[PDB]
């Protein structure tokens, strides 16, 4: 995260860490949506252009963290994966369209003050909160600058941007399964996700029922915090039926 501050303990209890076994390195961010399901970005797992194709056995999931490099004994839980499911129409060839994936954990995890799932939005929440100008929050243990890694989880709150503007900032074709967020060069504020923060959540706090809903997943960007550019996020709600389907087809 660039131009974001350190998070507070138990501020994002649903933030998960995909960790590679060998070498032991941070891979991406992810979120806890139930006690057995984690939601992340598909390209954190499969991206043929760079020979990336991870399997169950190659990852670990660490929940309850704050620090990036320490094994926070008695505070974090480390789970294994039982199955990874990538959206069947994820487009890695052209624009990372439907960049979403679900991982089922071997055993359910227990919640604590540091581990808690986030809510997935419903048509009415999605429609009232995804408006331009509304802010969301992103978190992760990714780079602090494009070219510089944090010790603690970082957080940044960014405004959602009007689709025409998102479009007029890139040569990539934007679909309805993505939205972009960030401050205009003109708004005197900065922030963005960066490498290492992919797969993590963009969430909003419903002013109706005080709950936090995950509206987007960190998907892609052109660099990290460049002016005139933005970060693109997968539109969780537009792909929710897919979610529901794997969950009530493969478990809960």
């Amino acid at each position: 995260i660039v131009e974001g501050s350190d998070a507070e303990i138990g501020m994002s209890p649903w933030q998960v860490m995909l960790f590679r076994k060998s070498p032991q390195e941070l891979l991406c961010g992810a979120s806890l949506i139930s006690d057995r399901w984690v939601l992340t970005a598909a390209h954190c797992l499969l991206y043929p252009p760079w020979d990336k194709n991870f399997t169950e056995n190659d990852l670990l999931v660490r929940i309850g963290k704050h620090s990036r490099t320490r094994y926070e004994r008695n505070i974090e839980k480390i789970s294994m994966l039982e199955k990874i499911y990538i959206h069947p129409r994820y487009n890695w060839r052209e624009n990372l369209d439907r960049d979403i994936a679900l991982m089922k954990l071997k055993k359910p995890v227990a919640f604590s003050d540091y581990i808690h799932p986030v809510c997935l939005p419903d048509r009415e929440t999605a429609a009232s909160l995804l408006q331009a100008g509304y802010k969301g929050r992103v978190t992760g243990w990714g780079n602090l600058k494009e070219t510089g890694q944090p010790s603690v989880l970082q957080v940044v709150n960014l405004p959602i941007v009007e689709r025409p503007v998102c479009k007029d900032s890139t040569r990539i074709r934007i679909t309805d399964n993505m939205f972009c967020a960030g401050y205009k060069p003109d708004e005197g504020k900065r922030g963005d996700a960066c490498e290492g923060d992919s797969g993590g959540p963009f969430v909003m706090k419903s002013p109706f029922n005080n709950r936090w809903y995950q509206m987007g997943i960190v998907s892609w960007g052109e660099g990290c915090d460049r002016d005139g550019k933005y970060g693109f996020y997968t539109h969780v709600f537009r792909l929710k039926k897919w979610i529901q389907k794997v969950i009530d087809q493969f478990g809960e």
């Binding site: 076994k21 032991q24 390195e25 670990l60 490099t69 320490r70 094994y71 480390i78 294994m80 890694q149």
Partner: peptide, 11 residues
């Protein structure tokens, strides 16, 4: 950079 984690999580 990361700290060793309990062997039991690799297997």
């Amino acid at each position: 950079d990361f700290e060793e984690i309990p062997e039991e999580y690799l297997q």
